Design a protein around this ligand. Structure first.
Ligand code: GDP
Ligand code: MG
Length: 636
């Protein structure tokens, strides 16, 4: 059963798309053929179509039908190209319709069948060289521009069926005559100057087929048909790929609709660009439908944010999803124009690659803040021990297995890492700058304490035998370990702030020097020291044996000797001075307001004040007097 694709009011049939869908399976693609038969009314057109292609047009607009089977001398044959057939009746008057219908047929058909009667071959009378000339014109206008400018090999086959052939004239003889009439008419056709050189054969192939008298030789007529079949489908002698219009079957209705609308409204129809447009439209909607198949298929994974992040197991789902999309797209779209098809595939690629990249970023720095957290941790756990290097080694393996782990889910480099490492880097550097200040300050603090611990034991030893050179001995030691700190830190320096860790480490030192001297030489200690010096000479022998006073010359004179021995030490301990007589001045004037806690008025060298010295002397005397009185009550 046949469908009218164009009725007499030049309207295009809406049902065509569904009609094509029924007769053509998803399989066809480019392997189909369009054949048109073109002629004035009742010249055997529907009859030839029904007998040859087995199609059901009515025998006494434009009608389309699928051919289930071709009539051949090998019987009913199904070619494996789908064959569609158009019955084009250009007259019923009108000359406008004729031109339009012929334009349609030539913009969609690979073969044009022209039925001409014999005794009337070579004459409008019962051929229409008027009809052929229209075909020549319509063909030139459709393909003359392409042919000149690209030299494309496109042709259409003219298949001339000679009807009611009797046989006194051989078909070979009729063919030669008619061929030369054809070329002649072509040469004389109005052409632009620059196509003047093109011939009939640059646009057309011809061949002939004689059919015997339908009414008077029915058996032979049947046979001649079957033989046309052999030519079409059994011997595949007629169809050629250079006749084929490059639009797969699924784009065909769109192509036919667009061609007809331009034709009907007298617009400039250009078939190359119209074929590109249908390809572009169709690949586009395959891109979109596939990309939507890829998406609810996506969501049902990726804001399911998930438990245990495996990077190779699903770094390859990325591949699967993207590969299955490629395959559903290749299936429908590869039939289309190569350039259009690949272009829109890339479009599909960089739509998939961008919603796959949002999972890329999430699972990525979830692993960065997972690894930065433990980075940060055993930095601290590496308790300041040689971070000279031990930053560089830790950053290295870190920055490295991020690369490894995350590469698993990039696609041979499609989703770039350049962004993510550039972040992981700055989050690593801005946290060595974190704890560099911690460990810089840390080595300051402990360097200060066993400075002060050494200072304290230096002073203590010196206290046993105070000389006018005991401050010398104290400052010597101090300034010694004072200059042994710096440039030796196992960190990233800052030539500047390596050395201003140093710079008042040098303070806290000066500060400590003051604090320790004043602790170790407080009134209370000084007094205790004085009593010890005193007893050493008043309570014991040189030997160290407890003393036994007999006389009071003995007591009184060693009493004087004991006191002086003790007090000879006061002028030295109450004020920090070297033998030269010079006051010890701290390098930094401490007790300064913001010179103090910029780094975290008294006298630094005054160990004991006047007022304190006077209290010490009063207390020294009272005690020393008592020891005296007693050891004299025990002499009697
Ligand atoms: N003598 C003769 N008559 C034919 C031939 N083919 C068809 N007819 C007759 O011509 C009439 C119209 O044919 P038809 O197929 O409807 O021509 P169409 O209108 O152009 O499709 C029918 O009655 C056919 O029987 C032929 O080859 N020879
Ligand atoms: Mg008809």
């Amino acid at each position: 059963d046949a469908i009218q694709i164009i009725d007499e009011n030049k309207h295009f049939n809406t049902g065509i798309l569904d009609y094509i869908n029924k007769t053509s399976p998803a399989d066809v693609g480019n392997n189909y053929h369009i054949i048109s038969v073109f002629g004035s009314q009742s010249t055997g057109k529907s009859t030839l179509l029904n007998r040859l292609f087995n199609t059901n047009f009515d025998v006494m607009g434009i009608w389309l039908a699928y051919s289930p089977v071709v009539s051949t001398t090998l019987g009913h044959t199904t070619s494996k190209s789908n064959i569609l057939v158009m019955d084009v009746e250009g007259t019923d008057e009108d000359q406008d319709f004729e031109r339009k219908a012929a334009l349609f047929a030539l913009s969609t058909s690979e073969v044009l069948i022209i039925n001409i009667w014999e005794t009337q071959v070579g004459l409008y009378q019962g051929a229409n060289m008027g009809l052929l000339k229209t075909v020549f014109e319509v063909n030139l206008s459709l393909f003359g521009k392409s042919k000149l400018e690209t030299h494309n090999d496109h042709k259409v086959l003219l298949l001339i069926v000679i009807r009611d052939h009797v046989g006194v004239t051989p078909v070979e003889s009729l063919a030669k005559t008619f061929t030369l009439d054809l070329q002649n008419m072509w040469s004389s056709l109005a052409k632009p100057a620059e196509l003047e050189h093109l011939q009939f054969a640059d646009f057309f192939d011809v061949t002939f087929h004689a059919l015997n008298h339908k009414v008077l030789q029915p058996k032979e007529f049947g046979e001649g048909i079957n033989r046309l079949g052999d030519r079409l489908v059994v011997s595949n002698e007629l169809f050629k790929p250079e006749y084929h219009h490059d639009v797969p079957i699924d784009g065909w209705t769109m192509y036919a609709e667009r061609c007809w609308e331009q034709i009907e409204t007298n617009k400039d129809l250009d078939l190359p660009t119209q074929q590109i447009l249908v390809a572009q439209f169709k690949c586009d909607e395959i891109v979109e439908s596939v990309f939507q198949e890829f998406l609810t298929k996506y969501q049902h994974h990726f804001k399911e944010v998930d438990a245990a992040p495996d990077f190779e197991e699903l770094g390859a789902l990325f591949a699967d999803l993207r590969q299955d999309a490629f395959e559903d797209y290749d299936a429908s779209a590869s039939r289309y124009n190569k350039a259009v098809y690949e272009q829109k595939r890339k479009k599909l690629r960089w739509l998939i690659n961008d919603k796959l990249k949002e999972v890329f970023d999430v699972h990525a720095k979830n692993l960065c803040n997972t690894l930065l957290e433990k980075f940060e941790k055993d930095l601290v756990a590496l308790k300041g021990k040689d971070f000279a290097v031990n930053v560089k080694t830790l950053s290295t393996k870190l920055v490295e297995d991020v690369n490894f782990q995350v590469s698993l889910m990039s696609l041979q480099g499609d989703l770039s890492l350049d962004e993510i490492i550039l972040a992981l880097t700055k989050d690593i550097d801005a946290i060595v700058a974190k704890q560099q200040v911690v460990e810089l300050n840390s080595i300051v603090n402990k360097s200060v304490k066993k400075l002060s611990a050494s200072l304290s034991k230096s002073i203590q030893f010196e206290l046993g035998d105070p000389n006018e050179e005991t401050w010398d001995n104290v400052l010597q030691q101090f300034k010694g370990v004072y200059e042994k700190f710096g440039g030796d830190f196992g960190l990233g320096t800052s030539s500047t702030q390596n050395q201003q860790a140093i710079e008042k480490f040098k303070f806290k030192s000066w500060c400590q020097f003051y604090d320790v001297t004043h602790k170790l030489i407080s009134r209370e200690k000084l007094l205790a020291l004085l009593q010890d010096r005193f007893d050493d000479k008043f309570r014991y022998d040189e030997n160290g044996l407890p003393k036994l006073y007999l006389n009071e010359q003995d007591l009184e004179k060693t009493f004087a000797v004991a006191k002086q021995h003790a007090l000879q030490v006061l002028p030295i301990l109450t004020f920090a001075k070297l033998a030269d007589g010079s006051e010890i001045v701290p390098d930094y004037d401490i007790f300064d307001s913001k010179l103090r806690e910029q780094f975290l008025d008294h006298c630094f060298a005054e160990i004991i004040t006047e007022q304190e010295k006077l209290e010490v002397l009063a207390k020294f005397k009272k005690e020393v007097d008592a020891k005296y009185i007693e050891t004299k009550r025990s002499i009697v």
